[model samples]
Target: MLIVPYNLPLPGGVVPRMLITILGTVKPNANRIALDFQRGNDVAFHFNPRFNENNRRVIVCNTKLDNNWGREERQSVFPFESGKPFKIQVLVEPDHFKVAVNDAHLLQYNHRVKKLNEISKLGISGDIDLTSASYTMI
Candidate 1:
């Protein structure tokens, strides 16, 4: 498992609109990979790719506030492969994040933490080997 995390202090400590980029490769036996945009211990966005699941062949999206998880949004589109390099871009808007995987539009997870600026950290975890990750204000 590869876990890479960092913080970005926006202008005035607020994230109006920005782009969070991730580059990585899945482990050969990977079962999952996730990008977590965090506020302290709270997760503003939990963008996850699940390669092996029984209930659904999908990506899991959710939010966490004060250790409580929100209703998950799962879609049946898995555009990733093990042992293959991949790119994931997240565009943060006022109400949601527009996400793309490998240059293709993926899905959106709405804002659960309203104070978006407080989401100052980016955490990548799960079964992936990350090459690079970046955050840009846009």
Candidate 2:
């Protein structure tokens, strides 16, 4: 499932910086791969990577309001590799939100829900297999 429920005009809107890119492949009995950066209903970011419920190393960052669920950021070096081919990058900073997976860097999420143009929207769902998803700004 890929839901880019737009309002996006540049990253989060109007731009200061917002870039998210995800190209994927991880379905050799996969279990999870999520990405989200939304607003309007609050969900500043939620990038999750779990392989069958966290046992093959995890990467779960969090944020959500109105549907409530916060505080959870875990990463112990699991750059995703099931059937291979992966790339994940996110960068929207003013307070935080810079991440990378296949490109390395991986971790940062602090602006809990402030106004990166009200976050706009972008989402991708579990079990991976996506070929591409992208948005960019400077």
Candidate 3:
């Protein structure tokens, strides 16, 4: 597991659109990977890997801020009302990201990747500062 830096930030607006991008590959023709972000806040993305195909996913968790702890469905995640920062987890498949947004919604993102073995060449860019992101093997 190699956690790279994807500094894709949440846009500046009342709408509060946040996004995190990942850049890397653990090995060739992957099978499984889970990203524990905020491992910080006890959130993670777990999924079975795919082949050389592109498969992107995003999940939004409506679990509120650290102070607003409560369980909610993935579809009814409310927007950041008080302007609090939420957790964003990214679990890359053979291709896309099995994403978890806020704490409720699960979505997918399909982006073409580079060589599947370039672990050290990952990068991140955005407004959402990654207090921490790392790699782990199963």
Candidate 4:
């Protein structure tokens, strides 16, 4: 029973060995969705899945500093589908964030903001029905 455009503050922030999980279902006519890790006004990590971008489905990852976005890292192996449920896991490692979808390895995005613990917020928006979101330290 979650809501779209949800924002949650990470208690103690993100650290190595931390895991963040998001459970949701894509809308039947979803166009795009995004999950963002933020440090105040800066976006530490931006995870976006686009279903109608240039007529192709892709996952785009990047960072934003001072309100400007960095280069986009696109993944061709799209694992999400319209009108389907999804489980997304983001594991914080020493140097990167490893992401998985539905318990399968998806992709990794290297640290662009660097100060892991400074990333204090999690944001989710766009076309999806969120079920739950949580984090744990391993």
Local error of candidate 3 at residue 87 (angstroms): 1.4
Candidate that would win on lDDT? 4
**What Cα-based lDDT does every candidate model obtain?**
0.79, 0.73, 0.33, 0.93
Tell me the tens digit of each residue's lDDT in model 2 across 7-56.
33334342447677777778787777777777767777888888856356
> Candidate 3 lDDT, tens digit per residue, 1-138?
222334222222101122343333333333322332222232222222222223432222332234443453232222222223445445455554455645655565332222223222223322232445433332
Candidate 3 runs further than 4 Å off: 1-82, 119-122
State each model's C-alpha RMSD to the native.
Answer: 2.5, 12.7, 16.7, 0.7
Q: Can you give the TM-score per candidate against the true fold? A: 0.87, 0.30, 0.34, 0.98
RMSD of 1: 2.5
lDDT per residue as tens, model 1, 80-102: 98889999998887778899999
* Clashing residue pairs in candidate 4 (N, C-alpha, C atoms within 3 angstroms): none
Q: Return whichever of 1 and 4 wins on lDDT.
A: 4
Separate clash counts for every candidate: 1, 0, 40, 0
RMSD of 2: 12.7
lDDT of 1 at 114: 85
As a TM-score, model 2 comes out at 0.30
Identify the superior model by lDDT, candidate 2 or candidate 3: 2
